[PDB]
Amino acid sequence: DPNRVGLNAATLDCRGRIYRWLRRGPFFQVDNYFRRSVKLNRDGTLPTDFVHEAPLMRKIIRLAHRGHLKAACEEYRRVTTVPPVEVYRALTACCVPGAKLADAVSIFEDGDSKLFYVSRD
Amino acid sequence: GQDVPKRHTHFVLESRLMYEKSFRDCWLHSVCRAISQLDEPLSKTVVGTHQKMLQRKVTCFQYNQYGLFKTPYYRLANVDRYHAVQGVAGTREWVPYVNVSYWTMNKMVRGGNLLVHRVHYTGWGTDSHLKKGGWEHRWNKVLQRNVLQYSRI
Amino acid sequence: SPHGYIRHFENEVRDLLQYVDGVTPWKQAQKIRTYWEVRSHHPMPQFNR
Amino acid sequence: YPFLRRPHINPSAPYFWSFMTAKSQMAFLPEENYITGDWTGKFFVSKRQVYTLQHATSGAKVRVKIFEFNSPSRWNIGKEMNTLT
Amino acid sequence: RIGPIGLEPHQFNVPAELGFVEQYDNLQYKRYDWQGWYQRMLDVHNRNVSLRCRICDLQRLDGNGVQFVDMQT
Amino acid sequence: GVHRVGYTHPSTLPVPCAQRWDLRLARARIFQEYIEEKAPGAWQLEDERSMSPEFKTFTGYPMRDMRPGYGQNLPDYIMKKRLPNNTHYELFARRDIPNEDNAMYGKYLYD
Amino acid sequence: LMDEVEDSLRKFQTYRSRFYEWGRAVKQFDFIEFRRRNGWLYDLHLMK
Amino acid sequence: HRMFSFALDWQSAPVNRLSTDTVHEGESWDAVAQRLGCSVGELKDANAERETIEAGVVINVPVTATRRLTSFGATPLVLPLKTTSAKDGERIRTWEEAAAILDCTVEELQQCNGHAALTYQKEFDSSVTELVAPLSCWTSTSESEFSPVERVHANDTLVAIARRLQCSEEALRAVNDGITDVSGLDFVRVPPEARRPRRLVEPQLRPQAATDALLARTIAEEETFKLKSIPHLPQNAERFPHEYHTPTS
């Protein structure tokens, strides 16, 4: 659904909404923007299949297959959707020939518990 | 009663929303002002016509933001929350720590809500930096504690 | 997330400059003039202080 | 009262461009000299709009909060609406 | 002593100190609907990490037999 | 007096040695230090109220820069300034409420 | 032993992300309401 | 090190160095280790799966190699559009066709080539002769990465430059025509068997094509409107010293 990508926001009109805005947690904007966004679908598959974020994943996999770990990490910072499993496979396989264990463990732990277990592969 | 009339609650809540809009807009406005008002080149990569075009484009982006908070902080930093009396920051009509007026501070002293220690009205209290150099020396000491004791990285 | 000064915001400045160059056309940015470009139409624009 | 912190804020020949005007000429015109977005029309403009060439050239309406500028001239070009009143 | 240990000759082991502040409120901001942003304010205000190392600890031999930090280093 | 700042490459000296300007450039590469081009060499004024030990307000760091008119319009002041994110203003915005009970819960929820 | 270890872990362990949200008044008042409604099911003294 | 050179000029530490390489046509175990600046037994320990190497196979660089390459070397990869080597035999008239040739996405070719995308649609209007590849498709060679020449000091001998570049004395004279005395030369050629070479530019420095990807709409509309210069000071600004004060002096 490429047409219905987007989220509407509020206006903070009444006094109780102002009091709720002043009583909100430390992560209220990013949490509600993340949970109002992509989530596990009705049949159980991942929300990976995103149209607008599709060529960024191709660029990340293309840069992690040529050995460019830092550029793939830099365009991994630009992701909004849950990235596919092939991103984590390409990133970890880029981490193998340099023996970079800490970067591979961080790559796994980023998608392990935070991103619906996409790196648990 | 009861606490304060609701128009003053609306006024204090609008002041809190102005503070929140300042937190929202200050980084963006500062980056836009620091790019758009610079005459030196930004980098080796961007020079000449690219820098002037980027400055004109960020000026067009900065002017297109309806509702950007560019108001300084000291213009509406004297709002009291318990009573409707308006004080002036910098004079004796305002206290900075509990952030109320002189009238509200006197009522909370006479009510016993605060834990404050009375000292002689012509001395400098107890702070050795305040007895040493005054308000400016304690200002510089708070600066030295907050920032200048850290070796930046 | 970076905190404090603007020198600690390296990626955010890059993303902001990229987004500003993305959304803003050049035909809008031509119209913004400086102060001396307006003052050039004055009959006596320049004198020493 | 603190120095120059009052919330409620003159002819000079050698200090014409430097008195109650921007410090540098490199800087651009302020926000009121341009249209921000979709507008239905403003009743009055702010006092910090710089009088340009097109103010005296076109001359549709100049309403300053009132003030009516119906005498266009070129001696006002390059200066904000504060010293013009 | 926690921390990784390098056995390759291109990995030097630096014994270093780390100083940091832990602060949790227990009087008023122990729990209510404000507790989240107050704890985040206490954590981000205590974001400083002081990493300290003696230069005499850097004047050891590397994996290649040469000294790590000499006089000119 | 008025002079031009010189630089000697280590390949030109009879005994090569690392200069101080390329060491400054390496330090600016490491710590991302802004190098101001228009900084004049004649204006090296210390904050002698704080730096001198025989003054009353002695603190070993210069608390104020000796520059008249170091204002908000200058972008180098904007770059090195502290942002008001999670300063005391955030505590003032989220704490200074006319009733504290509207900061610990919602009133409908408590009732 | 894994059942007892997960028992002691959910009794004494928290993360940083939960520690930012565990003191909200909604959860405290839900704890009070759950003790009020069915505290005959989980209480060391209500079994007696 | 200007203002906003912390974001647009320099990368974050550390610099990515390539741990993988491809074996060329006539390369052997002693020739790849010479090109990578490592020992031959150290190269085989990192590649203990392969007993021998063929051309065009992916080899693993040992991590202590002193001639490792940085990503996205400074030589741009150019692609001629009028090349008849495609399937149609004529100029490329599709962004997806050039993306399949260059092995990239459609969007990487649009940010890098803004003047081809903004002026003419996805045809292609043959006034554009060629286009540059995006940064992610560039490759780094060992001749373009490391500098092919070395400066001479005031007190250099042949032993000094050999110990500086970690090469042998006879390897230096072979590239430099057997010259012994180095007093009449301001530059010497470096042998490719030198273990300690000098790079061309700073590795932490960002390439200009990465910043021009951020400036994709800047360069696109510059060639369309034909903007060559914008004045920052008027024509008689230097005659009045106190009147024109920019906020940097």
Q: What is the 3 state secondary structure string of H151-217?
A: ECCCCCCHHHHHHHCCCCHHHHHHHCCCCCCCCCCCEEECCCCCCCCCECCCCCECCHHHHHHHCHH
- Count of beta carbons in the 10 Å neighbourhood of residue D20: 13
CB atoms within 10 A of CB H98: 21
**Which of H12, H216, H234 has the CB atom closest to C40's CB atom?**
H234
Task: Give contacts of C4 with chain F, Cβ < 8 Å.
Answer: 82-83, 85
Q: A touches D (3+ CB pairs < 8 Å)?
A: no
* Helix ranges, C1-49 (H): 10-23, 26-29, 35-39
Beta strands in chain H (DSSP E): 20-22, 58-60, 78-80, 130-132, 149-151, 187-189
**Cβ H90 vs Cβ H84: under 8 Å:** yes
CB contact under 8 A, A19 and F106: yes
Return the residue in F81, F96, F100, F102 with the most chain B beta carbons within 10 A, the one to mutate for interface testing.
Answer: F96
Query: Which residues of B fall within a CB distance of 8 Å from F38?
Result: 40
Q: Determine the Cα–Cα distance for residues B60 and E67; give it in Å rounded to an integer.
A: 57
Q: Is F82 helix (H, G, I), strand (E, B) or coil?
A: coil
Nearest residue to H122 (alpha-carbon basis) of H113, E11, F72, H101: H113
CB contact under 8 A, F29 and H3: no
- Residue A74 to residues A56, A69, A71, B68, F27, Cα–Cα distance (Å): 11, 9, 5, 30, 25
Which chain E residues are within 8 Å of F86, Cβ to Cβ?
40-41, 44-45
Looking at chain G, list the stretches that DSSP marks H as alpha helix, in order from N- to C-terminal side: 2-11, 16-19, 25-37
Please choose, from the candidates H136, H86, H91, the residue with its C-alpha nearest in 3D space to the C-alpha of residue H109. Answer: H136
From residue G19, give the alpha-carbon distance in Å to each of B115, D37, F50, G25.
31, 44, 43, 14
D2 touches chain B (CB under 8 A): yes
Residues of C within an 8 Å Cβ radius of B: 6, 9, 12-13, 16-17, 20-21, 23-24, 26, 28-30, 32
Inter-residue contact A26 to E43 (CB < 8 Å):
no
**CA-wise closest residue to G22 among B128, E39, H72, A34:** E39
Nearest-CA distance from E44 to chain F in Å?
8
Backbone angles phi, psi at H43, to 5 degrees: -70, -35
Are the CB atoms for A91 and A107 separated by under 8 Å?
yes
CA-nearest of D12, D79, H240 to C48 is: H240
Chain G residue with CA closest to F102: the answer is G25
Residues of G in contact with E30 (CB under 8 A): 23
Residue B29 burial class via C-beta count within 10 angstroms: exposed 0-12, middle 13-18, buried 19 and up: middle
- Spatial neighbors of C20 by CB under 8 A, at least 6 apart, are B54, B57, B58, B61
Dist. CA G32–CA G39, nearest whole Å: 10
CB contact under 8 A, F105 and E32: yes
Task: Report yes or no: H208 and B39 within 8 Å, Cβ to Cβ.
Answer: no
Report DSSP state, residue B146: I
What letter represents residue H116's amino acid? A
Cβ atoms of residues H190 and H143 within 8 Å: no
CA dihedral in degrees (B52, B57, B59, B62; nearest 10)? -150
- H135 — phi, psi (to 5°)? -65, -30
Strands B100-101 and H78-80: unpaired
Supply D37's token pair.
Answer: 């977005």
CB contact under 8 A, B30 and F81: yes
- Apex CA B116: angle with CA B112 and CA B119, to 5°? 125
Radius of gyration from C-alpha coordinates of chain C: 18
Alpha-carbon distance A40 to A107, whole Å?
21
Total Cβ atoms within 10 A of residue F57? 18
Q: Any chain C CB within 8 A of the CB of B23? A: no
In order of A33, A47, A52, B65, H150, the CA distances from A9 in angstroms are 9, 22, 21, 17, 61
Say whether residue F79 is in contact with chain C using an 8 A CB cutoff: yes
Q: For residues B80 and B86, is the Cβ–Cβ distance under 8 A? A: yes
CB contact under 8 A, D28 and B59: yes
Rounded to whole angstroms, the Cα distance separating A61 from A85 reads 10
- Which residues are H20's β-sheet partners? H60
CA B73, CA B71: separation in Å to the nearest integer?
A: 7
Q: Tokens in use for H163?
A: 């110990």
- b/e per residue C16-47 (b: at least 16 CB within 10 A): bbbebbeebebeebeebbbbbbbbbebeebbe
DSSP letters spanning B90-101: TBTTEETTTTEE
Q: Does E36 touch chain G (CB under 8 A)?
A: yes
Residues of B in contact with C32 (CB under 8 A): 56, 59-60, 63
Tokens coding B134:
């005054």
* Closest CB to H5 among B43, B50, B52: B43
- Ramachandran assignment for E60, one of left (phi > 0), alpha (psi -120 to 50 degrees), beta (any other): beta
User: Backbone phi, then psi, for H231, in 5-degree steps?
Assistant: -75, 140
| Maximum Cα interatomic distance, chain H, rounded to a whole number of Å | 77
What is the distance of C-alpha D41 from the center of its chain?
18
Question: Which strand (E) or helix (H) includes residue F49?
Answer: helix F48-51
Strands H20-22 and H58-60: antiparallel
Contact B49 H211 (CB under 8 A): no
CA distances from residue D8 to B11, B22, C33, D66 in whole angstroms, order as listed: 19, 21, 30, 18
Residues of E in contact with A24 (CB under 8 A): 36-37
Residues E36, G25: C-beta atoms closer than 8 Å: no
Q: Please indicate whether, in this complex, the C-beta atoms of E36 and G20 are within 8 angstroms of each other.
A: yes
CA dist., res. H107 & res. H117, Å (int): 10
Q: Assess D38–B contact: CB distance below 8 Å, yes or no.
A: no
The C-alpha atoms of residue H221 and residue H114 are separated, in whole angstroms, by 8
Query: Is it true that the peptide bond before F84 is cis, omega within 30 degrees of 0?
Result: no
Q: Cα separation of B86 and F1, whole Å?
A: 57
3-state secondary structure of F61: coil
Closest Cα of chain A to B16: distance in Å? 9
Let me know: does H192 contact H166? Beta carbons within 8 Å.
no
B43 CB-side CA count, 13 A: 22
Interchain touch G–H (≥3 Cβ pairs closer than 8 Å)? no
User: Residues of G with CB below 8 A from E23's CB?
Assistant: none
Give kind and range of the element (H or E) at residue A115.
Answer: none
Q: How far apart (Å, rounded) are the C-alpha atoms in residues A55 and A78?
A: 12
- 8 Å CB contact of B61 and C24: yes
Query: Please, are residues F50 and B143 in contact by the beta-carbon 8 Å criterion?
Result: no
Task: Say whether residue H60 is in contact with chain A using an 8 A CB cutoff.
Answer: yes
Chain centre to alpha carbon of residue F33: 11
What angle do helix axes H216-225 and B49-63 make, rounded to 10 degrees? 110
Q: How far apart are CA C48 and CA H237, in angstroms?
A: 11
DSSP track, D41-60: --SSB-TT-EE-HHHHHT-S
Contact yes or no for H243 and C47 at CB 8 A:
yes
Separation between Cα atoms, residue C30 and residue F55, nearest integer Å: 55
Who's near A75: CB < 8 A, 6+ residues apart?
Answer: A56, A59, A60, A63
Taken as a whole, chain D contains a residue count of 85
- Count Cβ atoms below 10 Å from residue H163 Cβ, excluding itself: 12
Asked whether the CA dihedral B151, F86, F82, C22 is positive or negative, the reply is positive
Q: How far is residue C17's CA from residue H231's CA, in Å, rounded to a whole number? A: 22
